[PDB]
Each structure stands twice: as C-alpha cells, then as structure tokens.
C-alpha cells in the first residue's frame, strides 16, 4: 500500500492508477 484515498478506504500501490480510480468520486449518491 503506497498511497490511500482521502474520500473511501481504498489503497494503491501506484499513483497514477489510484488517481484512475478516484475519477468516478466525481459521482455521489
């Protein structure tokens, strides 16, 4: 585990590919 999201409990040992993840946050509810 190299980085970790501020909004939910994932982690990702990349950063680029973990920054991929948190595009769909954009979306709530």
Known sequence: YKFACP?????FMRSD???L???LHENKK
Do not use: A, G, N, Y
């Open 21 to 23: 993840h948190i595009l």
């Open 7 to 11: 909004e939910c409990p994932k982690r």
């Open 17 to 19: 590919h973990l920054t």
